[PDB]
Specification:
monomer, mainly alpha, Methane Monooxygenase Hydroxylase, Chain G, domain 1, A middle domain of Talin 1, globular, binds pentadecane, binds sodium ion, calcium channel activity, cell membrane, membrane, transmembrane helix
Length: 300
Amino acid sequence: MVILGVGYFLLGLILLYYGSDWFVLGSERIARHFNVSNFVIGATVMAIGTSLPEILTSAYASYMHAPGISIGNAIGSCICNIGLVLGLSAIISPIIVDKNLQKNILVYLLFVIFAAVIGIDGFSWIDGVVLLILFIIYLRWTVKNGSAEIEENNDKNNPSVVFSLVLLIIGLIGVLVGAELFVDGAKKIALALDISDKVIGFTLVAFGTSLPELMVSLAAAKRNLGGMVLGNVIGSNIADIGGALAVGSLFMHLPAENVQMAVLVIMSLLLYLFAKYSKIGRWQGILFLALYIIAIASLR
Ligand SMILES: CCCCCCCCCCCCCCC
Ligand code: NA
Ligand code: NA
């Protein structure tokens, strides 16, 4: 069993590594094809793609009468995206945020503050419907503001668009399967070593759901695509709240997570202030990483 486990683990790392880059490359080309910014493609296609694990996990957990895990994982993912993912990415490729993207981050901040407020006494299915609708509105508003598309499908290099789309799809298949092989491999190794417990198990799952955002953003950062990185942090958090958290609330009332929500609000405000008045570079990234470390050391 340890052999299959090692095999799954290594293969997962390989698929994550090359899949993340193919996903980024395909997504960037697609953005160019359809006259939208990297932020837009990051906040829509890439964000949703990489958040599929959180959404499925939250749905499953709530359906299995574990709403605490459902909301814990969703908000935990948001803290990870800003703290670890953006933190690492900012150092690799410092990001200067233009005016239009600043506006988008501000709207993101309003969304998070709104969710924190209505979730003070937990989330009901009605809160979830509301958050889901706002999720949809955000996406359309983001696409419309970030698209200077001024041509029809007949104006494009359609065979090139096909290649880009296939690269994107295969990339995404790579990162999602890779993330799952990683988790299952590590679980098999832990089981084989007789060191598996529920703490290690849930830690493995929680981190597994975040591996796609992590690898994709790092891949984007190494290619100096800061707008894509930023899009795929902001969009993932909204998809995690408007999508993963909301869908969880549809199966069961979710318990309040006021401490984690407060942390997310503060990190979001920080992110906005940096975007608006400075940059998201080395010491901003250092700060975000320090806050993430404090979070994983002290949050229950
Ligand atoms: C860059 C990848 C390096 C992998 C190094 C692996 C060393 C042995 C790791 C055992 C991990 C066990 C994980 C489940 C507890
Ligand atoms: Na995502
Ligand atoms: Na994810």
